[PDB]
Amino acid sequence: DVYAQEKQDFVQHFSQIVRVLTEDEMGHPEIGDAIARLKEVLEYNAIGGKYNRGLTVVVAFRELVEPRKQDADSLQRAWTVGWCVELLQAFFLVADDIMDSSLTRRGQICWYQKPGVGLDAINDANLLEACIYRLLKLYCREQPYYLNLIELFLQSSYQTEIGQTLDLLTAPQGNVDLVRFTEKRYKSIVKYKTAFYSFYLPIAAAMYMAGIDGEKEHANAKKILLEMGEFFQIQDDYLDLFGDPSVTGKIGTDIQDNKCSWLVVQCLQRATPEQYQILKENYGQKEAEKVARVKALYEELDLPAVFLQYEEDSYSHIMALIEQYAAPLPPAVFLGLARKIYKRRK
Amino acid sequence: DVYAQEKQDFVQHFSQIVRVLTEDEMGHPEIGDAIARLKEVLEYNAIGGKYNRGLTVVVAFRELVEPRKQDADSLQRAWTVGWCVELLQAFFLVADDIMDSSLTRRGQICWYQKPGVGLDAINDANLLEACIYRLLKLYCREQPYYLNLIELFLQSSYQTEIGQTLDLLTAPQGNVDLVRFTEKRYKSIVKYKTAFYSFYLPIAAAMYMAGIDGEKEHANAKKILLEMGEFFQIQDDYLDLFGDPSVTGKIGTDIQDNKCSWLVVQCLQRATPEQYQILKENYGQKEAEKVARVKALYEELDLPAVFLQYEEDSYSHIMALIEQYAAPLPPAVFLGLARKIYKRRK
Ligand SMILES: CC(C)Oc1ccc(-c2ccnc(NC(P(=O)(O)O)P(=O)(O)O)c2)cc1
Ligand SMILES: CC(C)Oc1ccc(-c2ccnc(NC(P(=O)(O)O)P(=O)(O)O)c2)cc1
Ligand SMILES: CC(C)CCOP(=O)(O)OP(=O)(O)O
Ligand SMILES: CC(C)CCOP(=O)(O)OP(=O)(O)O
Ligand SMILES: [Mg+2]
Ligand SMILES: [Mg+2]
Ligand SMILES: [Mg+2]
Ligand SMILES: [Mg+2]
Ligand SMILES: [Mg+2]
Ligand SMILES: [Mg+2]
């Protein structure tokens, strides 16, 4: 409801974001070609997802700040900081699709697979990261929460890269790694690689912007939001294999990439010795026939039905956490996000 | 002299840098494997260069702060911030060697060419970047210049990526780009990709740490240091082709990578029509025989002798700039750096 409402306004602000980041060409014509590249990078990689994180900043901001304090400039800062989390996301996906050997993203060919781009996308991605701090300087430099936002974006990146490092270590190319695919390890990976930047970061940004800076308040929000993030990544794993890619906008690679997916961890908890063998001989390889063998094994094990049960039990648990930890923040802040992702198909 | 002095002390501090960045494992065992990866990334990619930038921070700090204010903690902050510029460097080289298809760096195989690393080095590189801000928080958070250092590292990265973007745009694989190899373009590329982070950043960091924060003072230092940086990159271009790679620690790729090198720009200013053709048919291609053809052309044009003349005229000009703009800073701050790089062979 409230996200659907805000979507079109959020997305409409993207022009200004592009215009402000491309305006520092005025005084330095010599960087013109780079700034034109930057604009193409922004248009290609910052558009076409759900904008759940940027919108969470805006929705939460509106719900946490007294409407009488939501003047024209305040609101612009809020959808600029929302856009900052979108740019963080864009940076991460561009680099991640290279590392995962992905083909499509958000319904088009991954940036690095475009003829003429290739591994230059590595620089493109980092530029997107640099844009976050340019926007924070340009719009929030005078605000009491400026340092807070800077340290929060920098810390969230570090935590996410640490998680990406656990993701890549647990998934070596060319090697079996079945022994490492545990529930415990899974939880640690998704906590760091997904939950901090995709759930905590946007709500925490809006908190700091509303002057809510206490450690206890931030730790409470984190208890809900890290659990929401773990759940969200489990849905992403489920969708990598069982989603419709004209809906999800992306082709899956977890089985080929030898990834510690929620699906493989479940598969393992339930496999007989002979099925364990099927998994061992077929998992983490590029052969289409071997990926199909693994899928058939998952479906044999009713894994889609096991995912639907986990999703219900988990949502219930997240709602309990909301009842426990939302105060003094409005529960709507957390529920609006839960309902945006509960039972999602993309 | 003064750099040679400080080298061994600087390098000895690397253990502590590793220890502090790997100490946040204590409380979170679950990230243990990632932190062990981080340590391997640090040891492989942060060690073995000249440490000119980290050392410039330390030397300049010692020369700008009254010795009576150089207590144990102050000095540690200074060689930590020196190490931050070294980590920035490490991040950049790891990513750059992937983009340039390089083979060796600092006398060993590039990180991404190690079996088992490959494009995972993209995440490794960004982790190195994240380490800078962790160290600034851990050591300088209480200092009046903390925000100043954060914005200075973030701005320097942005400017360097903009330069890297001009470097990659001017050097398309598969395409002739002779028309773009101008003196003007060359100057713009190296100003952004090299001069800001390699010259301005370390001296400016030491300035801010000495409480020297005025815009006029920073603009004066910048006039010297951007010129020093352009000169330094011209030497790097010269070394890509004419250096001994057991001395430089790296194999060159500029001609194969179609790069707007100082050498190609000079070549072009002096080529006859027929030599222009030789360049056109041979430049920017992987064929060993075609790279050799270009080299023979450079040597035919006395380009090594032209480089030696430019180096002298330029050093003289940089020394004039020092006479103009060093005040009120001690000229030794700038000269120590000039003499460390004038006539360098690595
Ligand atoms: C510096 C850069 C390499 O760091 C990161 C880049 C991307 C990510 C990240 C985190 C969480 N999810 C993704 N992408 C998903 P996705 O490709 O959209 O299914 P995953 O590959 O984990 O399934 C990427 C994390 C860190
Ligand atoms: C995010 C990352 C891709 O950004 C950068 C990474 C590296 C660099 C950079 C800047 C200046 N020099 C280098 N390396 C040199 P080098 O390889 O050591 O000769 P260049 O390839 O320019 O000749 C790299 C600049 C930006
Ligand atoms: C963490 C992760 C699944 C990366 C993809 O996130 P998303 O599914 O939120 O992607 P969009 O930004 O495309 O909506
Ligand atoms: C800017 C550039 C030439 C990158 C290499 O710099 P360097 O030559 O300063 O490298 P070390 O850090 O290896 O000394
Ligand atoms: Mg992926
Ligand atoms: Mg991934
Ligand atoms: Mg996925
Ligand atoms: Mg290079
Ligand atoms: Mg390069
Ligand atoms: Mg070079």
Short mmCIF file of C-alpha atoms in Angstrom, two decimals, chain A residues 28 30-31 33-35 37 91 95 98-99 119-120 122-123 126-127 129-130 133-134 137 141 146-147 150-151 154 158 161-162 164-166 168-169 185 188 191-192, chain B residues 28 30-31 33-35 37 91 95 98-99 119-120 122-123 126-127 129-130 133-134 137 141 146-147 150-151 154 158 161-162 164-166 168-169 185 188 191-192:
data_model
loop_
_atom_site.label_atom_id
_atom_site.label_comp_id
_atom_site.label_asym_id
_atom_site.label_seq_id
_atom_site.Cartn_x
_atom_site.Cartn_y
_atom_site.Cartn_z
CA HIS A 28 35.44 21.09 -15.67
CA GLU A 30 37.80 18.16 -19.43
CA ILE A 31 35.91 15.42 -17.53
CA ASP A 33 33.31 12.10 -21.42
CA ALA A 34 33.65 10.56 -17.94
CA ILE A 35 30.55 12.32 -16.68
CA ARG A 37 29.83 7.59 -19.02
CA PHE A 91 27.30 -0.78 -7.14
CA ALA A 95 30.11 -6.19 -9.25
CA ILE A 98 30.54 -10.25 -12.69
CA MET A 99 31.56 -12.50 -9.72
CA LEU A 119 35.56 -5.67 -16.96
CA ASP A 120 35.47 -1.91 -17.25
CA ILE A 122 34.50 -2.82 -12.21
CA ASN A 123 35.31 0.92 -12.42
CA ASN A 126 32.91 1.90 -7.87
CA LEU A 127 31.85 5.16 -9.42
CA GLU A 129 29.65 3.88 -4.84
CA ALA A 130 31.47 7.27 -4.99
CA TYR A 133 29.16 10.25 -0.76
CA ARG A 134 28.94 13.07 -3.31
CA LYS A 137 27.96 15.98 0.92
CA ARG A 141 26.60 18.31 4.85
CA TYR A 146 25.77 13.93 8.39
CA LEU A 147 28.68 12.04 10.04
CA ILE A 150 28.54 8.62 6.38
CA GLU A 151 29.69 6.10 9.02
CA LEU A 154 30.66 2.96 5.18
CA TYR A 158 32.18 -3.19 4.98
CA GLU A 161 31.69 -7.17 1.68
CA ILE A 162 32.58 -9.36 4.61
CA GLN A 164 30.24 -11.45 0.15
CA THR A 165 33.68 -12.76 1.16
CA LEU A 166 31.99 -15.63 3.16
CA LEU A 168 32.66 -16.67 -2.23
CA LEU A 169 34.83 -18.71 0.21
CA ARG A 185 27.09 -20.99 7.97
CA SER A 188 26.22 -16.03 9.03
CA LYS A 191 23.30 -11.83 7.94
CA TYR A 192 26.39 -10.03 6.57
CA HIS B 28 32.33 -12.57 16.01
CA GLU B 30 31.32 -16.51 12.59
CA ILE B 31 33.28 -14.13 10.31
CA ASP B 33 37.14 -17.28 7.46
CA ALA B 34 36.43 -13.84 5.97
CA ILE B 35 38.85 -12.14 8.31
CA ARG B 37 40.87 -14.02 3.75
CA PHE B 91 42.57 -1.40 -3.70
CA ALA B 95 41.25 -3.67 -9.59
CA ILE B 98 42.24 -6.88 -13.74
CA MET B 99 41.10 -4.02 -16.07
CA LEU B 119 37.38 -12.26 -10.30
CA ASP B 120 36.83 -12.75 -6.61
CA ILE B 122 36.97 -7.58 -7.20
CA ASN B 123 35.53 -8.15 -3.68
CA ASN B 126 36.80 -3.30 -2.15
CA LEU B 127 37.53 -4.83 1.21
CA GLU B 129 39.00 0.15 0.48
CA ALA B 130 36.66 -0.54 3.46
CA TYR B 133 37.52 3.87 6.93
CA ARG B 134 37.71 1.24 9.67
CA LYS B 137 37.31 5.39 12.82
CA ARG B 141 37.44 9.36 15.46
CA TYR B 146 38.37 13.25 11.41
CA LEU B 147 35.59 14.45 9.03
CA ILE B 150 37.06 11.08 5.61
CA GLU B 151 35.90 13.61 2.98
CA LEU B 154 36.28 9.85 -0.38
CA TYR B 158 35.98 9.74 -6.70
CA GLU B 161 37.81 6.82 -10.59
CA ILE B 162 36.80 9.67 -12.85
CA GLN B 164 40.29 5.85 -14.55
CA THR B 165 37.02 6.29 -16.47
CA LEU B 166 38.80 8.73 -18.91
CA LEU B 168 39.37 3.38 -20.19
CA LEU B 169 37.18 5.50 -22.55
CA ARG B 185 43.58 14.67 -23.13
CA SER B 188 43.31 15.57 -18.06
CA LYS B 191 45.56 14.78 -13.42
CA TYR B 192 42.51 12.78 -12.27
#
